[PDB]
Design a protein that fits this description.
It is classed as translation. The protein has 19 helices and 17 strands. With 544 residues, the protein is of the alpha/beta class. The protein has three domains: 350 residues, 3-Layer(aba) Sandwich (Rossmann fold), CATH 3.40.50; 35 residues, no CATH class; 138 residues, Isoleucyl-tRNA Synthetase, Domain 1, CATH 1.10.730.10. Strand 1, helix 1 and strand 2 form a beta-alpha-beta unit. Bound molecules: methionine (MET) and zinc ion. The site of methionine (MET) has 9 residues, from helix 7.
C-alpha cells in the first residue's frame, strides 16, 4: 500500500474558478479516486494562493481588508470545487500560520546554506502612493508608435515590446502620479547552484518528455538568480530580520502545499505523517498536477528550494495543456469564458468530468471543449451506451421478477471478457492515459449493448413461457453495467452513487470478480437524462 500526496496548483484568490481550473482539478480528482480504489493511502491537497500586490490593491479598491476578500474568495472557490465533487482531503490557504512558519524555515535554511544573496536593484516607484510598481501598474505612451494609454512592457496597438522605463509620460495605474526610478535591496535565491542537480532530474525519464524538452531550453538560456523579495506595502509574509521586506508570493506559494498538508496533519492530531511525507528519506510519493504556464516554478525553483532546505523533492510533475472552447482560447465576447459556477447552473458536474476525461492523455497538449461535440458525446456515451444497459433492463427485473437478478450468469465468457479488461483499464488510469481508458470502456459498452440486441429482450418479453430467458438476459446486462460503472467510478461520482443505490452495492475494483447473483436491485428514476444544444446556447448567453 502506497502513501501518495497529490496536489493541484493553488488558485489565486483574486478571480473566480473557470473551466481552465476545472480541467486540472478534474484530472487530478479522477487519478486520486482511482488510487483510492486500488487501496492506497492518498492525501489530495490544495489551497488558495492568497498573497501579492494585485490582491492587496484589489482589497484596497473594494474598501475591505485583504483578509476579508481572500476569505470570501476561498469560500467561493471551495463551493465551486465541491459542486464538481473534487475530493480534497484538505483545502487550506497560503495565508496561514503553517505556511508562514514553513516559509520562514525554508528561507532560514537556504540562507544558512549559502543560497541567499543580497543585491540592490532599480525599479519604477510611485512616490505619491509610496510603492514600487510592477510593470503592469505602469501606463504611458508607446515610444515607438506614440499610442497613449498602454500598459506594462508592450503596446496593444503596434505590438512593440519595451521596458516600461521607455514609456513616454509614464503614469502610475494606482495613483496617476509620475513614477521615478528608485533603488531597493532585494534578496535572491541562487538557483544556478542547483543546475547540475536539476539537469540530472531532467534526464532521469520521470518527467513528461515535452516538459524535459522545455527544461533543456531553459538550461540553454541560462539559469539566473531569482528575486524572492518585495518591498512594503505588500500582502504577504514579512522576511525575518529584514524590516519592510516580504517574501514574493511565488516563494511562499508552493510552500503552501506543505502548509496545507501540515494543517491537515495538525487537525487530525497526527504528529508523524508530515515528516513521513516531507523528510529526505521519505518512501511516500509526491505528485503535483499543474498547467504548462507554471512549469518553471515547479521544475526549477521548487526542487531546488526543497533540496537546499533538506526536504524531499517531487516524485513527478504531471503537466496538462490549456482548455480551449470551440477550438479557441476562451473568449468573453463570445461567451466561452465560462465560470465553474455558471456551468453548474446549466449542466451537471459529471458531464464535464466525462468529456474532459475522454480527451485527456499523459501529454501536455491542449484540451478542446467543443460544445456541439459535448452534447453529442455525453448523449451517445453516457445515456445511450452505459446508462442504457441499466435503463433497458431494470424495468423487466423490477416489474416481472420482484427486483431479483438471476442465480447464474447467462454468458460467463462475455462476463470474463469484461473483467479481464480491468488490468489494461487500470493501467490507463494509472498512467493518466484517460482517453485510452474511456475508449476501452466504451468499446466494452458497445459489446454489452450488442449482446442485449442479439438476445432481443423486447421480443422475448412478449413470448409465452420465456420468463426465465428474459430474467437471464436482463440480469446479464445489469452485471455488465456493474462492471462498466466500476471502471467509470473515478470519472462519474454522482452517477456512480445513483448506480450503487440501484444495485444495492458499493462498487469496488475487486468486487467485479463476484457478479450479482440472486440479488435484489432497487427501482430508479432516470439515472441520466439527455442534454441538448438549447442548453449550450443558454450557457454561452449567460456567460457573455
Ligand atoms: C503553488 S501553485 C500557484 C499557482 C498560481 N496561483 C497560479 O494560478 O498560476
Ligand atoms: Zn505602439
Amino acid at each position: 500500500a502506497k502513501k501518495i500526496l497529490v496536489t493541484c496548483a493553488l488558485p489565486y484568490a483574486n478571480g473566480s474558478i473557470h473551466l481552465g481550473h476545472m480541467l486540472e482539478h478534474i484530472q487530478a480528482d479522477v487519478w486520486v479516486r482511482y488510487q483510492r480504489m486500488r487501496g492506497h493511502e492518498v492525501n489530495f491537497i490544495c489551497a488558495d494562493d492568497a498573497h501579492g500586490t494585485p490582491i492587496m490593491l484589489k482589497a484596497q479598491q473594494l474598501g475591505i481588508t485583504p483578509e476579508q476578500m481572500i476569505g470570501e474568495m476561498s469560500q467561493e472557490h471551495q463551493t465551486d470545487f465541491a459542486g464538481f465533487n473534487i475530493s480534497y482531503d484538505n483545502y487550506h490557504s497560503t495565508h496561514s500560520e503553517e505556511n508562514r512558519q514553513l516559509s520562514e524555515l525554508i528561507y532560514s535554511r537556504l540562507k544558512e546554506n549559502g543560497f541567499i544573496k543580497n543585491r540592490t536593484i532599480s525599479q519604477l516607484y510611485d512616490p505619491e502612493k509610496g510603492m514600487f510598481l510592477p510593470d503592469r501598474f505602469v501606463k504611458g505612451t508607446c515610444p515607438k508608435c506614440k499610442s497613449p494609454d498602454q500598459y506594462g512592457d508592450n503596446c496593444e496597438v503596434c505590438g512593440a515590446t519595451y521596458s516600461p522605463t521607455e514609456l513616454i509620460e509614464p503614469k502610475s495605474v494606482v495613483s496617476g502620479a509620475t513614477p521615478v526610478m528608485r533603488d531597493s535591496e532585494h534578496f535572491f535565491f541562487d538557483l544556478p547552484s542547483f543546475s547540475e542537480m536539476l539537469q540530472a532530474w531532467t534526464r532521469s525519464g520521470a518527467l513528461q518528455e515535452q516538459v524535459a524538452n522545455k527544461m533543456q531550453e531553459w538550461f540553454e538560456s541560462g539559469l539566473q538568480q531569482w528575486d524572492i523579495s518585495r518591498d512594503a506595502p505588500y500582502f504577504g509574509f514579512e522576511i525575518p530580520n529584514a524590516p519592510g521586506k516580504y517574501f514574493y508570493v511565488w516563494l511562499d506559494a508552493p510552500i503552501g502545499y506543505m502548509g496545507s498538508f501540515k494543517n491537515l496533519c495538525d487537525k487530525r492530531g497526527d504528529s508523524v505523517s508530515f515528516d513521513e511525507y516531507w523528510k529526505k528519506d521519505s518512501t511516500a510519493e509526491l505528485y503535483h498536477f499543474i498547467g504548462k504556464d507554471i512549469i518553471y516554478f515547479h521544475s526549477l525553483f521548487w526542487p531546488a528550494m526543497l533540496e537546499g532546505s533538506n526536504f524531499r523533492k517531487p516524485s513527478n510533475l504531471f503537466v496538462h495543456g490549456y482548455v480551449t472552447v470551440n477550438g479557441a482560447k476562451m473568449s468573453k465576447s463570445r461567451g466561452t469564458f465560462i465560470k465553474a459556477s455558471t456551468w453548474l447552473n446549466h449542466f451537471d458536474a459529471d458531464s464535464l468530468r466525462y468529456y474532459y476525461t475522454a480527451k485527456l492523455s499523459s501529454r501536455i497538449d491542449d484540451i478542446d471543449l467543443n460544445l456541439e461535440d459535448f452534447v453529442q458525446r455525453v448523449n451517445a456515451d453516457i445515456v445511450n451506451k452505459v446508462v442504457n444497459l441499466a435503463s433497458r433492463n431494470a424495468g423487466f427485473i423490477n416489474k416481472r421478477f420482484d427486483g431479483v437478478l438471476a442465480s447464474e450468469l447467462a454468458d460467463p465468457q462475455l462476463y470474463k471478457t469484461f473483467t479481464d479488461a480491468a488490468e489494461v483499464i487500470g493501467e490507463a488510469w494509472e498512467s493518466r492515459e484517460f482517453g485510452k481508458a474511456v475508449r476501452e470502456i466504451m468499446a466494452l459498452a458497445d459489446l454489452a449493448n450488442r449482446y442485449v440486441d442479439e438476445q432481443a429482450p423486447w421480443v422475448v418479453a412478449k413470448q409465452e413461457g420465456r420468463d426465465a430467458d428474459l430474467q437471464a438476459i436482463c440480469s446479464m446486462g445489469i452485471n455488465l453495467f456493474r462492471v462498466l460503472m466500476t471502471y467509470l467510478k473515478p470519472v462519474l461520482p454522482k452517477l456512480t452513487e445513483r448506480a450503487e443505490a440501484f444495485l444495492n452495492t458499493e462498487l469496488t475494483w475487486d468486487g467485479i470478480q463476484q457478479p450479482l447473483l440472486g440479488h435484489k436491485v432497487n427501482p430508479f428514476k432516470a439515472l441520466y437524462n439527455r442534454i441538448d444544444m438549447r442548453q449550450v446556447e443558454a450557457l454561452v448567453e449567460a456567460s457573455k
